[PDB]
Amino acid sequence: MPEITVKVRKVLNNPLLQRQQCVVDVLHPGCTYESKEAIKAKVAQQLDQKNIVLYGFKTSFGGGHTVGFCNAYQNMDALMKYEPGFRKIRCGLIEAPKPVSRKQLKNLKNRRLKKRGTEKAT
Amino acid sequence: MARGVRKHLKRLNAPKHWLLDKMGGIWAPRPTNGPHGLRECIPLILILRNRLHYANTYAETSMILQDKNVLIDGKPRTDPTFPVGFMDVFEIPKVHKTFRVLYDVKGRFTLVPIQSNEAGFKLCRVQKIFLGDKGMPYLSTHDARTIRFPHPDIKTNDTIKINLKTGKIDEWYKFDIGKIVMVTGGRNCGRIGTIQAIDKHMGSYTMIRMKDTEGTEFLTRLCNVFVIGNDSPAVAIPTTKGIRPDIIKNRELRLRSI
Amino acid sequence: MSKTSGLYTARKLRTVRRVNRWADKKYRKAHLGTWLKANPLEGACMARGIVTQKIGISAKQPNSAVRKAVRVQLTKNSKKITAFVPRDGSITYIDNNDEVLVAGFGRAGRAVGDIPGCRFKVIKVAGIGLLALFLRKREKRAR
Amino acid sequence: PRISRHRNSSKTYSTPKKPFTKPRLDAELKLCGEYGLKCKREIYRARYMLAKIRRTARNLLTLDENDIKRRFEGAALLRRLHMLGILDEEKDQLDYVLGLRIEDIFKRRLQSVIVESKLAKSVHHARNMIKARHISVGGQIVNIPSYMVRISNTSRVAIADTSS
RNA sequence: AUCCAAGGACGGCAGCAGGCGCGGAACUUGCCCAAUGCGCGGCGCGCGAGGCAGCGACGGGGAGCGCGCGAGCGAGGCGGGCCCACAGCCCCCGCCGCGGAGCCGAGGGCAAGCUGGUGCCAGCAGCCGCGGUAAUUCCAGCUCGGCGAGCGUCGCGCG
RNA sequence: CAUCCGGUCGAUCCUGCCGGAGCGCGACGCUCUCCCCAAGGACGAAGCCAUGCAUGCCCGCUCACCGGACGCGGCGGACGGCUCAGGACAACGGUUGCACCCCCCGCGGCGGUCCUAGCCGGACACCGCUGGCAACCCGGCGCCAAGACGUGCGCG
Ligand SMILES: [Mg+2]
């Protein structure tokens, strides 16, 4: 097992969003890592294991070097407000309701606009 | 011919000194009317997102501004497209960062950090004196501000110091030979020098000849000559003192930094 | 000298060239407009027409041969032309009252070779290239 | 419109004006065999780059020595040529550039550098080895035969650690 | 041009897709506001602007159908990651492992020649010209040359 | 990145054209292993258009059903997107001016108004009852709100 050693680059404090900016690079010459999950512990050590987000992970030619981003929040509430939804859905933070086709929504909107007075029927 | 005013702005049609990537998108922010014009300003979002990097998107900047986290000349502004101009005060109390917006030698906007003692005022250029309603004397400036009942000793093209808290004039610097100035338009934006000559042509422009500290001499029209004190600057200026290096020295500096 | 050469004589030189560059046959043929109105293809690479008669044309004096050609009428003009199908034994693939595509020869609008007064070539019939039919790449069992 | 419209693009090579020329065919085949080139587009690319460098050198040479533009552009051009290893280090005059030739460009290809290091038996063997990703530059695997190695990386070319 | 329970009513794709006609000539009646912006607005909505995907040899760039006397690596398939608004794609990790070249030409210009047919016929030929019993030029086989995942033909512009 | 070659004669030198050799833009034809970028009904039809979508949002006004509906009101819809018919001292490009001009949002100021003011008046929309017409469309009666409308307290 080739030990994987990860760093922290470009540390910036963001009290406005209550988070820390972060560029994280991981060296795994030989084998690979485990779905970005083993990395959370190392990042937490270097800078709660459930208050970080990783999203921009790219593997270079040959697989020797992988570079990405991280976002560490001070509270779960802050992560709940300042955060796009799809990130929460990708993470195990919330559940995703079954999306509906926007075509049906447009059709319903046009149909309703067609009616007059009380059109809540359609 | 468009039937009304313009609300959009193509990215390729934006000012060069904003430094916007060609592939960022089709569109660029359109600044709203305010203290400064389109070509002598820079939107707030560009400073807050593409420079300081405290935000990564339009939405984050919108939240930050509508939560009241930036003060411009002592007044909170919630508009992401609010225009920021020359000799403006940029303070962020949440991180105790205070900046004054000035020009670099290359001809772009820069943030010079300042102190508490000098952040209670700003410098303004007076370019118009007129009589208003009831014959009351008035006076306007480069940041779209008007002051009633100015001192008769104040003339056009002068420079005025006003307290941020109260728009009251303290002292004024006259436009005269031997006064340090700063160029704010054209090929020589960001250069600092002292006035050596003044030549006027009836019915046309007035040309000002300035000499830099090192002996270099340059010319520009009076419409973009800003007085910044009496032989010594009144405010803190960038680390460099308005010296534009030649391409050779800039290349040497680049290689050294490489 | 023979040509004017004064420092203030640009107008005369411009006018002289403007008048005199109309004496070249090529320049006239290109920039005059008569050829475009007279060319049945109106400056197009090729045209589509209907064959109406299959005929054979003798060659010139020093040669001796009967070349196989067809008479065509262009859809978009309704005028008549003569187009020649060169490849051996390719007349039998062309049938009377058939849709064809007709292009030009190497020279712009002059006759080519010993074929007298012929300026067009057949390349496609019934939607299949003649060059492909001759090599047996495809078959015309739809007709 | 789509942002894809503002993407630039250009060609990289030139074809000879007279194609059927016996000495040219012989020389091109000779060079192809010597360096094991795939097709004749590579030679055209090399000629294109050489022409660009020569034109720049000509324009600079037409001017005076103490012209600021001449100094700036010549300095940049010489630095690039030296870093790339095409021109010998001991030459620092713009005149020497006009004497350069495509063979100097070829000698800096990856195949060549690994062959002169005795790391491959032949140019063809070098190409086959490069394709299979058994080679590396500065710890990074490079699988492009036409990749050009800079002088500073010449001693850093080795066999891939992970290759069998 | 449309509906009419014949008194009346109704329309303007040179907006995105799609259809007819025309022509030598030109794509899906797809998904989404996550990005760039605009409108309104305080913890957001909408936008065929715009983004993503599909067809796509207009076209541009990079690799390859072997090296060697034995080993090795591709494409491709089955799975796991990364990415993505959801999904592909690239890239990385594991087990099996589809190695496929055409288009033009061989008298000169212009690099590249051997039998069999036909007999100024059939046909070639941008120009010069060949073919009326060896056809170095037609039709076939062998061989050879040029460019090459591209090659050739037609029209236009520059040279 | 400063190039020529074949063709008038029994032979030769010229003028002079015909043809070849290169690049690019499109169409046709043969063929096609992998990856990246990428144009795409413009070419004397600005010809004709089924079908679906392309402009909404919300602070004010809730005795509506159990505050969400709906409606009044406000902002926006004059930007964006498509095409090149028409127009040849015009449009357009650079350079002046308005001491002959208009201008929403926004920023900064300024803010004195002649002759019931603990807060004025009447309506419409939604809605209830009664109805016309194939459809599209609306009629009459009736209680109710305003940052809606009207009147208007005031140092010219
Ligand atoms: Mg009164």
Counting Cβ atoms within 10 Å, is residue C85 exposed (0-12), middle (13-18) or buried (19+)?
buried
**Protein CA D41 to sugar C1' F39 (Å):** 25
**For chain D, what is the radius of gyration of the CA atoms?**
19
User: Could you give the CA distance from residue C48 to residue C101 in angstroms, rounded to a whole number?
Assistant: 5
Q: Give Cβ neighbours of residue B63 (< 8 Å, ≥ 6 apart).
A: A82
The number of distinct structural domains making up chain C is 1
Q: What are the phi and psi torsion angles at B14 (to 5°)? A: -80, 160
Buried b (16+ CB within 10 A) or exposed e, A70-82: bbbbeeeeebeeb
With an 8 Å Cβ cutoff, are A62 and D140 in contact? yes
Q: Give Cβ neighbours of residue B67 (< 8 Å, ≥ 6 apart).
A: A16
User: Could you give the CA distance from residue B117 to residue B114 in angstroms, rounded to a whole number?
Assistant: 9
B113 and B43 part of one domain: yes
Counting Cβ atoms within 10 Å, is residue A22 exposed (0-12), middle (13-18) or buried (19+)?
buried
User: Could you give the CA distance from residue A108 to residue A114 in angstroms, rounded to a whole number?
Assistant: 10
User: Could you give the CA distance from residue B183 to residue B210 in angstroms, rounded to a whole number?
Assistant: 10
- The letter for the amino acid at B65 is L
- The letter for the amino acid at A64 is G
> Where do the DSSP E strands lie in chain A?
5-6, 9-14, 19-27, 52-53, 58-59, 65-73
Last residue of a domain, one of B98, B117, B136: B117
For the record, the structure tokens of D75 come out as: 């300095």
Query: What is the extent of the structural domain holding C51?
Result: 1-142
- Any chains having at least 3 CB pairs less than 8 A from chain B are A, D
**Cβ within 7 Å of strand F: which of B 178-207?**
204
Give me the CATH number covering residue A53.
3.30.70.3370
Ligand 1 centroid from CA B132, angstroms: 26
B255 belongs to a structural domain: no
User: Could you give the CA distance from residue B38 to residue B83 in angstroms, rounded to a whole number?
Assistant: 8
B208 belongs to a structural domain: yes
**Protein CA C63 to sugar C1' F11 (Å):** 28
Counting Cβ atoms within 10 Å, is residue B214 exposed (0-12), middle (13-18) or buried (19+)?
exposed
- Any chains having at least 3 CB pairs less than 8 A from chain D are A, B
Partner residue facing D3 (CB), from B23, B248, B251:
B23
Query: What is the extent of the structural domain holding A64?
Result: 5-91
B252 belongs to a structural domain: no
Chain A residues bordering chain B (beta-carbon distance below 8 Å): 12-17, 21, 82
B27 and B67 part of one domain: yes
**Protein CA D24 to sugar C1' F4 (Å):** 17
**Protein CA A116 to sugar C1' F131 (Å):** 19
Q: Which nucleotides of E are covered by protein (CB under 7 A)?
A: 22-24, 30-39, 41-43, 46-47, 49-52, 59-68, 72-74, 80-86, 91-94, 104, 110-111, 120-127, 129-132, 138-139, 146-149, 153-157
User: Could you give the CA distance from residue A26 to residue A67 in angstroms, rounded to a whole number?
Assistant: 6
**Which of B56, B57, B66, B67 to mutate: most A Cβ within 10 Å?**
B56
The number of distinct structural domains making up chain B is 3
**CB-CB contact of C19 with C12 (8 Å):** no
Task: For residue B53, list chain A residues with Cβ-Cβ distance below 8 A.
Answer: 12, 21
Buried b (16+ CB within 10 A) or exposed e, D30-65: ebeeebbbeebebbbbbbeebeebeebbeebeeeee
- The letter for the amino acid at D89 is E
Find the helix or strand (DSSP H, E) in which D27 lies. Answer: helix D22-35
- The runs of H, that is alpha helices, within C1-143 are 10-20, 25-31, 34-38, 130-134
**D162 close to A (CB below 8 A):** yes
**CB-CB contact of C110 with C80 (8 Å):** no
Partner residue facing D72 (CB), from B22, B25, B248:
B248
Query: What is the extent of the structural domain holding B229?
Result: 175-244
With an 8 Å Cβ cutoff, are A15 and B53 in contact? no
- How many angstroms separate the Cα of C95 from the Cα of each of C31, C104, D126? 39, 21, 60
In 3D, which of B121, B89, B86 has the Cα closest to residue B104? B86
Query: What is residue B47's DSSP assignment?
Result: I
10 Å Cβ neighbour count for B129? 14
Counting Cβ atoms within 10 Å, is residue B168 exposed (0-12), middle (13-18) or buried (19+)?
exposed
User: How do D135-137 and C66-74 pair as beta strands?
Assistant: unpaired
B253 belongs to a structural domain: no
User: Could you give the CA distance from residue D62 to residue D98 in angstroms, rounded to a whole number?
Assistant: 13
**B63 close to A (CB below 8 A):** yes
With an 8 Å Cβ cutoff, are A61 and D161 in contact? no
Q: Cα D12 to chain center, whole Å?
A: 13
Contact flag for C and D (3+ C-beta pairs < 8 Å): no
Q: Give Cβ neighbours of residue A93 (< 8 Å, ≥ 6 apart).
A: A79, A80
User: Could you give the CA distance from residue B211 to residue B208 in angstroms, rounded to a whole number?
Assistant: 10
- Nearest chain A residue to D141 by CA distance is A62
User: Could you give the CA distance from residue A87 to residue A94 in angstroms, rounded to a whole number?
Assistant: 10
B83 belongs to a structural domain: yes
Buried b (16+ CB within 10 A) or exposed e, C115-138: beebbbbbbbbeebebeebeeeee
Distance, in angstroms, between D160 CA and closest chain B CA? Answer: 29
C109 in contact with nucleic chain F (CB within 7 A): no
- Helix, strand, coil shares of chain A, percent, nearest 5, are 30, 25, 50
A113 belongs to a structural domain: no
In 3D, which of C96, C81, C93 has the Cα closest to residue C124? C93
User: Could you give the CA distance from residue B38 to residue C89 in angstroms, rounded to a whole number?
Assistant: 76
B6 and B83 part of one domain: yes
- Where do we find the tokens 């063997």? D125
B6 belongs to a structural domain: yes
B62 and B100 part of one domain: yes
A120 in contact with nucleic chain F (CB within 7 A): yes
The three-class DSSP label of residue D93 is coil
Distance, in angstroms, between B188 CA and closest chain D CA? Answer: 20
Q: Helix crossing, D68-84 with B247-257: angle to 10°? A: 30
For the record, the structure tokens of D142 come out as: 């490079």
**CB-CB contact of C67 with C115 (8 Å):** yes
User: Could you give the CA distance from residue B220 to residue B191 in angstroms, rounded to a whole number?
Assistant: 11
Domain assignments of chain D as residue spans, ordered by start: 19-164
A119 belongs to a structural domain: no
**B247 close to D (CB below 8 A):** yes
Distance, in angstroms, between B214 CA and closest chain D CA? Answer: 20
Ligand 1 centroid from CA B134, angstroms: 22
DSSP letters spanning D43-61:
HHHHHHHHHHHHHHHHHHH
User: Could you give the CA distance from residue B187 to residue B60 in angstroms, rounded to a whole number?
Assistant: 36
The three-class DSSP label of residue A57 is coil
Q: Which long-range contacts (CB under 8 A, 24 or more apart) does D85-90 make?
A: D85/D149, D85/D150, D85/D151, D85/D154
